[PDB]
Amino acid sequence: MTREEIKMIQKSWLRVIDKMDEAGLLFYRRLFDVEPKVRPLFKIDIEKQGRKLMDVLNWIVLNLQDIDAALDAARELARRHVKYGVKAEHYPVVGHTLIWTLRKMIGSEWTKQLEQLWTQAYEALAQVMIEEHHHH
Amino acid sequence: MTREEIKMIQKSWLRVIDKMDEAGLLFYRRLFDVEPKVRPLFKIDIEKQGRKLMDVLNWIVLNLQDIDAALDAARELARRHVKYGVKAEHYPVVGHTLIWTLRKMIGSEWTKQLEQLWTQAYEALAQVMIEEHHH
Ligand code: HEM
Ligand code: HEM
Incomplete structure (x- = not known):
């Protein structure tokens, strides 16, 4: 992904972070409506549903940043090669x-x-x- | 890739290093035979061809190790998910x-x-x- 594409993702993320309790309730309601069989897997404190959904979104975004960073050595190498012709x-x-x-x-x-x-x-x-x- | 697959790469890599001067010569001879149009891109120095190919192979393998390490967080997360059912x-x-x-x-x-x-x-x-x- 491009730096701006990652930027777009992070912005959408911060938009939802604001309404985290609402997002959390929506997620589980939806998940258990479509896939009721996974309900028993989720042994979370009922008051932390928002926090727990936020943690998933956080994990994805932070990991996306780390992977982007890890790719930078190859992009660095490619930029030297552009210079080589x-x-x-x-x-x-x-x-x-x-x-x-x-x-x-x-x-x-x-x-x-x-x-x-x-x-x-x-x-x-x-x-x-x-x-x-x-x-x- | 699995750790065992990366080790297979690493082992074949160490084998080439053992005769890197010969690998270098073979590589550049082949590249320029197959694709002479790219010849002007390279700096002329036959005696360094071993070293030059080695930089390339080293870069590939070490970067491969770096990327594999970067994936370990996702893999750890997945192992916890296996435990979750x-x-x-x-x-x-x-x-x-x-x-x-x-x-x-x-x-x-x-x-x-x-x-x-x-x-x-x-x-x-x-x-x-x-x-x-x-x-
Ligand atoms: C790429 C996809 C996913 C990501 C990034 C993700 C992320 C997370 C994170 C950060 C946690 C907190 C605990 C931990 O770090 O181990 C968690 C817990 C959990 N996730 Fe996921 N998850 C993903 C996919 C899934 C899927 C497909 C399921 C299937 C039902 C699932 C079910 C659960 C359950 C049951 C827990 C533990 C709830 C508890 O604490 O009882 N996750 N996940
Ligand atoms: C994934 C593929 C490749 C890798 C891993 C790689 C790796 C390297 C490395 C490590 C160097 C040493 C200088 C530096 O680090 O910047 C180098 C130099 C160089 N590479 Fe590559 N390279 C790749 C693809 C290519 C391709 C497709 C060409 C096309 C002709 C090319 C041509 C050159 C040239 C002209 C140099 C300058 C050194 C010289 O003049 O001999 N490389 N490469």
């Missing part, structure tokens, strides 16, 4: 060539599983870096 | 209900964009938690 379209050939090289060095003990893991790691990283390229 | 099948209805509540509360200021953002955030989180449930 690398473009989004160049990432596949590098990945294939990395994989080609590994498979050749690792030799006999190279597995389809290993190749899948290296591929997943590369594509996931390249996806975040590519997003950064498109911001430029 | 929660099942992977419960995640979609709770997500729908959470976003339904936000939409009702925010009222006229709600937008499709906001709804799509909360959806993306919830689904990405739930996907990590559900993976933990299935272990």
